[PDB]
Amino acid sequence: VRRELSCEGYSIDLRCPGSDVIMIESANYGRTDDKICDADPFQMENTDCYLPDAFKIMTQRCNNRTQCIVVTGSDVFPDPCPGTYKYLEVQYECVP
Amino acid sequence: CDLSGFVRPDPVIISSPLSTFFSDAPGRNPIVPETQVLHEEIEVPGSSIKLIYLSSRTAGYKSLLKIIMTQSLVPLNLIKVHLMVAVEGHLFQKSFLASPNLAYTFIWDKTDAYGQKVYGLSDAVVSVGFEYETCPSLILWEKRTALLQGFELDPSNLGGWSLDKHHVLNVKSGILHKGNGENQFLTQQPAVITSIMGNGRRRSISCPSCNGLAEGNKLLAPVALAVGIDGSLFVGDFNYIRRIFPSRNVTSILELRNKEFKHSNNPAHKYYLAVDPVSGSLYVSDTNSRRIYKVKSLTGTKDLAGNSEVVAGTGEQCLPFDEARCGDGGKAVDATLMSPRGIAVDKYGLMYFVDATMIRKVDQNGIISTLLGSNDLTAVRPLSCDSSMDVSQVRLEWPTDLAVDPMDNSLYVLENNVILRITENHQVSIIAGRPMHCQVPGIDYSLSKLAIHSALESASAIAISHTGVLYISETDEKKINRLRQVTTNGEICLLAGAASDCDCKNDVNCNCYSGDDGYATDAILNSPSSLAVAPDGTIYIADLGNIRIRAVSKNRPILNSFNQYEAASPGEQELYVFNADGIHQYTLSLVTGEYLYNFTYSSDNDVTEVMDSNGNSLKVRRDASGMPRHLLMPDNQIVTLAVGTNGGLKLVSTQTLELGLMTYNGNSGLLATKSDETGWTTFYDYDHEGRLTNVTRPTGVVTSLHREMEKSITIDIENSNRDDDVTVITNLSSVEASYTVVQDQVRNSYQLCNNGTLRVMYANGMSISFHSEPHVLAGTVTPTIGRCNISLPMENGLNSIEWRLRKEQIKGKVTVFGRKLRVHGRNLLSIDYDRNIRTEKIYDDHRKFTLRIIYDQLGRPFLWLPSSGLAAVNVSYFFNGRLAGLQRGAMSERTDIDKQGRIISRMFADGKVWSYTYLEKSMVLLLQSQRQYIFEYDSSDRLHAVTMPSVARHSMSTHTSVGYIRNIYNPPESNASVIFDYSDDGRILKTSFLGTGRQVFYKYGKLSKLSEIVYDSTAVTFGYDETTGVLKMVNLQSGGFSCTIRYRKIGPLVDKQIYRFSEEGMVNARFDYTYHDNSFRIASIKPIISETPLPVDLYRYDEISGKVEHFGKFGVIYYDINQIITTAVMTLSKHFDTHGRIKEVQYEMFRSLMYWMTVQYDSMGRVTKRELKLGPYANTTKYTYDYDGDGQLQSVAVNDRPTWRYSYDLNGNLHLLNPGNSVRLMPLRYDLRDRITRLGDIPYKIDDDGFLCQRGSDVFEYNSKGLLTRAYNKANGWNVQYRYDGLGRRASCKTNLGHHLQYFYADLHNPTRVTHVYNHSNSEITSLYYDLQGHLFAMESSSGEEYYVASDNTGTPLAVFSINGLMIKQLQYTAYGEIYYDSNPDFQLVIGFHGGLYDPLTKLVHFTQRDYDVLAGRWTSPDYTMWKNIGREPAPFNLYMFKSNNPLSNELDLKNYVTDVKSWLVMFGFQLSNIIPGFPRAKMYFVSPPYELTESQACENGQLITGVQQTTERHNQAFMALEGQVISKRLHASIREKAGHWFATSTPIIGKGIMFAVKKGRVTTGISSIATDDSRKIASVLNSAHYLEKMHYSIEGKDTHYFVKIGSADSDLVTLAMTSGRKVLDSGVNVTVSQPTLLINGRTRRFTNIEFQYSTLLINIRYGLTADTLDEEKARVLDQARQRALGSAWAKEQQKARDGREGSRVWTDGEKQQLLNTGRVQGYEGYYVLPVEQYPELADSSSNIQFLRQNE
C-alpha cells in the first residue's frame, strides 16, 4: 500500500515503477480529521465530510496507468461540504 | 531693534546611542563596537549561571550630546553663538564666537542637580542662540530636545557584576535590564493603540447613564479634545462636554443647547476646546454661536445647560469689512466675532483664537485685540519658503486648529495644509507643509525626511507635547486617515494610521476600525477630528468616524491582578515576573509554563538564592550591609568573593582555582584588568567619556576602537596583528537607526525601524526583512518576529517564511500553545504544546510525520514517541537535572556519578562497564579487558599527559606566544612535536610537525576571511569580490602547475563553478546551476568538460518537506523511513529497521533481481549477520561477525565456517589477521608511538610526523598538508603522481603505465563527492550517481554506456551490471577492505572501500583529509585534532585505528539516540534546508573535510564583529528554532574552554599583571598591582624594543622570537641584577646574558644578547647603537635560517640516495656518489622556490629548497 494526500486546489501525484500500473484501494475528497490541511476555525467544524464517488473518480482516472495527476478541487470533484476546507486522501497499489 | 528675515539657528543634536547591544559569547568576543562597551564573563563551577560585567552599567560610562550649532557657511552679521543644556535640573551655559563648523560636546555624569544618581532615560533641553552685530542686546533662540541614557539598575549587587539569570525592571522608565547584559528599552518599542472611550455605536441625545466607566461608554460625535492640569481628558462629545477622570470614570460637565442629533457630523457645528495652564479653566468656542465660553464648575452641577460663562462675542457675525474692526481695543464680551475656531492658552494665561482668517488675543484684563491683523492686503507679501517674516506681512487662508508649544511658548496655526509658528517676538515661519510658492521645481533632490519638504494631505487637527513634539491629524475621510509626528529636529513620520485599501465614507461593505490592542502604525483610523497630549506623552485621537477616543501610548508593562509586572524573551522562550517595584520574582517557560528560576531576597532586597527547576540552589551569602562574602554552589562548593574598597569585585576563587582577579579605574567602576588561573591578564583602556578604546592581550595583540561623533557616529575597529579594519557608521533619524558595516569596499547595511522591522541588505545582493507582531501569550510588551521576507538578486527571487502563533484558554488559564511554520501560504510543520498532559506534538499537514515529546513533572523532555512504528527514545536524569542515561529500544548507555558530580561508571546494554577513578588531578579509565588509560590534568581540567595501556606516556602543553597561542603535543619518548598555533579569536594560524619539518601557514585578509594557505613550495590564494565580498577564486600555485577554481554567485548561492589548469594535457571544466523559482533549491546542473557539453540533470522536490523526488533520470518514492530509487529499467529499494539502520537492500533490473543484501545487528548496533546475493542466478552467501570484550571485530565466518581471525594489542593495534583469502595467520608489529613496523614478513616505515613513508619496496611521498603527492616502486616499475586543488581535494591521478584520470566535484551540498571523472586514454566522461545515503548506485558514460552498481551497507561497490542487466564485475572484500576476489580486473572502478578513491598500486583508499591502508587495516596518518576534545570526553583511543576496530558497523555516537525534532525529520526524508532558507544542512561525511573547504562554504554567512550583526543573527537563529525546549545531550562534565587553548598552560614569560603590546613592530609594556618584581624586570627590559615581524622560527624545538634595542644594555642589566651567565627567576624563567660573535656573510659582529626562556618559549633581544641594528638582525636571522634550510635539504637528499629512493633532482652516477661521500654536490646549491622576500616564514623550510647549477 502507498499513500498520497493533497489539500484543496493542489494536485495529487501517483507514480508506479517500471511497467507496473496503479490500482486504487481507497479514496476520499472531503474532511475526516480536524488537524489535516490547516486553515481558519471553519476548517475543523466538520470531520464527517465524505464523497462516495471519490473512489469511482480516482479509479476511472488512475487505474491501468503508470502515472496519475488529479487536482483536489471543483473541476474534478463535486462539493460534499461547502464552506469546509477539503482535502483528497488516497490509498493505492502498483500491480503488473 | 527689529530682526526680520534673519538666519535662525538650525542645530544638529547627536546623542550617544542607548546600550542595546551585547555579546552572544562574552568569553569569545568581549568587545561591543557601536556602544564601545566591554562585555565580560566568569564561569563558576557547580552551576550554569555565570557572572556578567557590562561597562555601560558603571558611573564612568557617561552620556554624550554633540551639538553642531554652525555649518561651513556663517551669516554675514553673526558675531556670537550662545549654548544652553538642561538635564535633570542642571543648567550648562557657554558663550562662543562666530566660526565655521562650530560644535560642542556636552558630557552628562548621569546625576541630578542635587548630585543624586538618575536612573533610566532622561530628556535634555538644548538652546542655541544667535547674536548679530546689528543688535547686541537681543539673541535669536531655538529650543530642541534630546534623549540621554541615565544609570542602569544593578540587580545582583556583586561588585558591579550580575548573575546571568537574574534580571531587574525599571518601572518608571520602562527598561528591562537582564543579567546577561541585554537591555530592553520597552518605551522605544512600537507604540500601542487602544480604545479609551466609545463602542462604535451612537448614544441618545439626552445622555442616559453617561456618568460611569469610560471604556465602552457610548459617544455621539467627538469633535474636540483637551487635557486638563489634573491629567483629565475633556471630550467635546457634540451635545455634551464629558470629563474623563484619571480614575477612568466619566461625568458630564456642560450641555450645549444649540446642538441637534442631525448635525452630529456637520463641520459648521464643530467646536474647539482649550485648557488654561495657569488655572485649569476649560474654554469652549462654537463657530455656529459666534461666541467663546468658560466652564464654571469642572465637577458638573445640577443644571448642566447653564454651567458656562461668556468670555468673548455677543452672538452676531460681523461683516468682512467692518468699520469698528469687530470691537477691537475694547472688552472681549462686548466685541463681535466672525467665526471662532481653534483656541490656545499661553503660559502667562493669554488666550488666542482663530476668527475667520485672523488670530485674535484676549488678555488677562479682558481686552480684545488682533495678533495677525487682516485687511492690510498692500503690506501683505506672499509666504516666504526659507526666511521668517513679521505677523503684518502674513495673510491667512482657511485657518482651523490652534495650539501653544509648552516648550517654546510659541503659537502654532493650522492653515490650508500648512502649519505656521508665531514666536513670542511675533515672527512667522512654515514648520510643516509645502505651499504652492515653491512646489515644483522648488526642491531638486525631491524626497527628504524634513517636514518643510513634505506636503500635508487634508490636515484636520494639531497637538503639541511638553517636549515640543508636534502631532498632525490628516483626514481625507476616504483612504487617508492618519496621525503624523514632527520632532524638534524638523523630521516628519507616520505615528498612527495605516493606508486603508477601502473607502471609509463611500464603500458600504467597509470596516475602517482595526489595530486596537496592537501596534499604532498597523491600525486603521476613521475621520480623526481632534488631538490632545496626556502628561505621560500619550496622544488622544477623536476618531469621529468610529465614534471612539483612541490613545497612542508608549509600549509599557501593565500591572496585573496580582500587582505584578511581566516581560518576556521569545528568543530564549522565557517569561519574567517582577513585583510592583520591578524586583525579579520568577522566570517561567514561555512554552511549558513551568517555573525555571525562583528568586529569594534578604530584608534589604539583596538577592540571596536562585533556585532552578531541578532543585539546584545557588546561594549568595551576605553581610548585614548587603556585601557579598561567597557563593554556595548547588554541590555545596564555596566560591569566595572579594569586593574592593572601590566597590568592585576584586577576586572570584575556589579552594584551588583563581577564577577571576580584577582591578578598576578609581571609583568609575570601569574594569582595568582581568586575570584567570592561567595567569592570562587582559588590559582595558577607556577615554574620559568611559568608552572602550583599547583591549591588550598577553600575545601582544591590541584591538583599537576610534569614535568620530558627527552627523553620523563612525566607529573604526583596528587590530595590531591583522589588516581586517572594520568601520561601523550609525545614522539615527525619526523613522529608523541606520547601520553600515564597511570592510574596504564591501558594505553591509542594517536598518532598525520604529515599526519593529529589522532590514538587512547584504553586500552579496540578498536582502532579509524581519517583521514584528505582538506575542500571542505575552502581549504588546514583547514584539516577536512572525514574518520573514527574503529577496535574492534574480528573476523570481522573492521568498517568505511565516510563524503563526495561537493559544487555547480554559477558565482564563493557558492550556495549549501552538506554533505553525509556513512557506508561501502552505503549512510545513506545527509544534503544539499541551500544558495539561505535558506533551509536545510536532506534525505534518499531510499525515507523513508525527512526533510526541513527553515532559516530566520538572518540565524536562524525557520520552520521544515517533510514528511509522519506530523505536521510542527515553532518557534518565540525575537529581541535579544532568543527563544520566539514554535508551532507544534494545540499545542503552547509562552513567553513575560521584558526590562531586564526576562520572565514576559507564554501563552499556550488552553488559560492558567502564570504571572512572580520580586520584590527585589524574583520572584512570579501566575497561573489563583490564585495558587502562591514565589522563593527567591541570587545575583548569586541561590535559598534561595521557598514559596508554602499553604504559607509553604522551605529553601536552599550551603557552602564550608573540601574536598567537602555541599548542604542543609530544609523542612517547620523542622530540617530534606536533604544534597547532591559534590566534586570540580562535582561528588556526600554523600547523607544524617538528619531526621532519612539515608546516602549513594560514593567512587572513581585509574581510577577516581566509586569504592564503602556504605549505612547502605551494601557495594557495583565496580571491574575494571587491564589492560583494563573496569568494570569487581559489588558486593553487606549485611552481609551473596552477589549479584555479572560480565561482559566480546569486547572493550567497553558487550559479557557476569553473575549473582551470595550466598543464598541457589537463582538461578544464564548467558547471552551470539554476535555482527553482522563489526558493534556494538547485533546479539544474549543466556540465561542460573539455569543451564537450554533457546532458543537464534536473532536480524536483516536494515543496512541503524538501524531499528530493527526482534527480537526473532517477525518481524517488518515500514510505515511512524507507526509500525507492526508480527508472524505467531499475528499482533500488532500501529498507530500514526500528532504529533507522539498513536491514534490506534490493536491486532489480528489467523486473529481475540482480542484488539483495540483509543486515542484522546486536543490542549495541554492531553488524552481526550479512546475507549477500551478487547476480540473479548466483548462490546466497551468509557472513557472521563476532566481537571481543571491547567491541573489536574478533572473527568472520562464511556460511557458518570460520575464515577470518583478528586479534588486538592493549592499545587496540591490530596485531593478528588472515590476509585476503589466506588461511595463514599473519602478525603485525608496532613501536612505542603505535606506528606500524612490520606486516608478516613485509617491513613498514612511518616517519617522525606519523605519516606512511614505506611498505616494503613501495615509497610514499606525503606533503606538509598531509596529501599523497607521489608513490612508486622501483622493483615493480610503477609510479603514480597526484594533483590537488586549493580546497584540498584530489584533482588528478597519473601513472607511468598510461593511466590518467581527472576528478570533479559538482555537488554543492556534498563538496568532497566525486561527481564526474575524465579519462584521458579514451577522452570519455563518467557521471557518478549516489543514493540518499551517499552510496554509489549508478554510472553514466559520455559514450552512451550505462552501469548499475551494487553497494553494501558501508558504501563499498561489490558488483557492476551492464545496460542490458548483465553482471560484468564482481568484487569480494575482507572486513578491513582488502580485495581477495575480482571477476573482471580490467573493468576499472574509481570508488572502492567505504566510498573512497581506491588505488590498486598503492593499496590505499583516499578520503579528502585522510588515507586508509587496506593491507594493515589502519589509517596512514594520525588525526592530531583528537587531542583537542579527548580531555573533555575521555574514552579508549588510538591515533591510527579504523572505526574503533569495527569496520562494518556505523561508528557508535550519542547521535544514535534521536532527541531532537530536526534529527527525527531527517530520518523521514525531510530536508528543511531546501524549504527554509539558511537552515543548517545535515552533514554527510565519513571523514571530516579540511579547514579551507568547510570555511569556503561558511564565508558567505553574515559576519559577527559588530553589535548590529549579532542582533541580526539572534533574529535569524530564533526564527529557525523548532522545539520549545532542547536537552543537553552530553554524558560528560562541562569544562571551561578558552579560545585556542587545548592543553595545560605553561608558566608565561609575560607574567600575570604585565601588559605587553606590539604595535607596528614596536614593543610597549605596562605594570599592574598584582605583578611580581621578577615579572616587572622582564617588562622593563622588553619596553621600547623592536620585534622582528614574520621572522620567528622553531629552532631545536624552541618557539624563538627576535627583538632589537637601540641603546646600551647597562640600564637593563641593573634591572636584571646581573652582568653575564644564566639567572633563574621566582617563576622559573631563565635569563641568559652573553656577548656573542657571529660571522654572517663574511662580516664579523659582536653585541650584547639578553635571552628570556621558559620550556619551549624563547625571547631573544639584540643590543645595538646604529640605525641599521634592525636590518642587521633581520639579515642575521635569515642567514641562520638559510643555513638550517640548506643543512636539512642536503641531509634529506643524501638520505634519499642512501635509501635508494628518487631524489628532488636527477643526479648522474658521479653526482650521486659525491653526495653519498661528502654530503654536497660540486656546482650545485640550494635556492628558494617561493621567494624568502615575500615569504620570510619559510626561511628555514627544507621543502622550499631546490638544487640547481649556475646554468639555471
Ligand SMILES: *[C@@H]1O[C@H](CO)[C@@H](O[C@@H]2O[C@H](CO)[C@@H](O[C@@H]3O[C@H](CO[C@H]4O[C@H](CO)[C@@H](O)[C@H](O[C@H]5O[C@H](CO)[C@@H](O)[C@H](O)[C@@H]5O)[C@@H]4O)[C@@H](O)[C@H](O[C@H]4O[C@H](CO)[C@@H](O)[C@H](O)[C@@H]4O[C@H]4O[C@H](CO)[C@@H](O)[C@H](O)[C@@H]4O[C@H]4O[C@H](CO)[C@@H](O)[C@H](O)[C@@H]4O)[C@@H]3O)[C@H](O)[C@H]2NC(C)=O)[C@H](O)[C@H]1NC(C)=O
Ligand atoms: C579509461 O579508458 C580505458 C580505455 O582507453 C579503459 O580501459 C579499457 O577498459 C575496457 C573495459 O574494462 C577493457 O576491455 C576489456 O578487455 C578484456 C581483455 O580481453 C582481451 O584478451 C582476450 C584473450 O585473453 C581476448 O579474447 C579479448 O578479445 C575481445 O576484445 C577484442 C577487443 O580488443 C575484440 O576484438 C574481440 O573480438 C574480443 O571480444 C581481449 O583482447 C576483456 O575480457 C573485457 O571483456 C569483458 O568485460 C566486458 C565489460 O567490461 C564485457 O562486456 C565482456 O563480455 C567481458 O566479460 C567477460 O569477461 C569478464 C572477465 O573475465 C567476466 O567478469 C564476465 O563475466 C565475462 O565472462 C564471460 O564471457 C567470457 C567470454 O566473453 C567467457 O570466457 C567467460 O567464461 C564468461 O562466460 C573487456 O573487453 C580494455 O582492454 C581497456 N582498454 C585499454 C586500451 O586499455 C579504462 O578502464 C578506463 N578507466 C576508467 C577508470 O574508466
Ligand SMILES: *[C@@H]1O[C@H](CO)[C@@H](O[C@@H]2O[C@H](CO)[C@@H](O)[C@H](O)[C@H]2NC(C)=O)[C@H](O)[C@H]1NC(C)=O
Ligand atoms: C526507558 O524505559 C524503560 C521502560 O520501558 C526503562 O526500563 C526500566 O528500568 C528499570 C530501572 O530503572 C528496571 O527496573 C525495569 O525493569 C525497566 N522496565 C521495563 C520492564 O522495561 C528504562 O530504564 C528507560 N531508559 C532510560 C535510560 O531512561
Ligand SMILES: *[C@@H]1O[C@H](CO)[C@@H](O[C@@H]2O[C@H](CO)[C@@H](O)[C@H](O)[C@H]2NC(C)=O)[C@H](O)[C@H]1NC(C)=O
Ligand atoms: C630532536 O633531537 C635530535 C637529537 O638530539 C636533534 O638533532 C640534532 O641537532 C643538532 C643541532 O641541529 C645537530 O648538530 C645534530 O647532528 C642532531 N643530531 C642527530 C644525529 O640527529 C633535533 O634537532 C631535535 N629536534 C627537535 C624538534 O627539537
Ligand SMILES: *[C@@H]1O[C@H](CO)[C@@H](O[C@@H]2O[C@H](CO)[C@@H](O)[C@H](O)[C@H]2NC(C)=O)[C@H](O)[C@H]1NC(C)=O
Ligand atoms: C633553565 O635552564 C636549565 C639549564 O639549561 C634547564 O634545565 C635542564 O632541563 C633539561 C630538560 O628538562 C634537563 O634534562 C637538564 O637536566 C636540565 N639542566 C640543568 C643543568 O638544570 C631548565 O629546564 C630551564 N628552565 C625552564 C623552565 O625551561
Ligand SMILES: *[C@@H]1O[C@H](CO)[C@@H](O)[C@H](O)[C@H]1NC(C)=O
Ligand atoms: C465609576 O463608575 C461606576 C459606574 O460605572 C461607579 O459604580 C463607581 O463608583 C465609579 N468609581 C469611581 C472611580 O468613583
